[PDB]
Amino acid sequence: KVTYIIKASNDVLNEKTATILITIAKKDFITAAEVREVHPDLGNAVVNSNIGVLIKKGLVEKSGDGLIITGEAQDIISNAATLYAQENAPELLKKRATRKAREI
DNA sequence: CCTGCATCCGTGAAACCATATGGATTATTAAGCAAAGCTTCTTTTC
Secondary structure, three states, X not given: XXXXXXXXXXXXXXXXXXXXXXXXXXXXXXXXXXHHHOOOOXXXXXXXXXXXXXXXXXXXXXXXXXXXXXXXXXXXXXXXXXXXXXXXXXXXXXXXXXXXXXXX
16 A cells, blocks of 8 residues: 555655545545544644645645645556556456457 | 018929859658557346
8 A cells, every 4th residue: 555655656755644645646636624634643733744745845736725746646656556456456457359450 | 770562482272144042842751640440348138
């Protein structure tokens, strides 16, 4: 899960901003009060510190009240589900028959 | 010199040679593209 996140980010993160990053990429332009709501274990300035890291890294930014990742963090998520497909859903990553097509 | 008349000017109702030259035009090809067509997964029927 966050193994693929922090591993896919080359360990630039910790688990707090990992699951917060799952929350931000999970619903587009959500409020940080919902982030603190689904993270009751973390403090208000702990969540705001982790958003200070993602803003500090420039991944998650605002749109007025908006909160969303950029495309590079999106590539980190898609690599995370890629390795999650390599190790957790192996037959989901498959391929069917391919047409040639035409023969002389 | 300055008063006094005249006027008059405005003002409206050839051909060629040569030499670059580059920009304009044409051809030629790589990319791409919409449309078609396999391949498998559901969906509907008896």
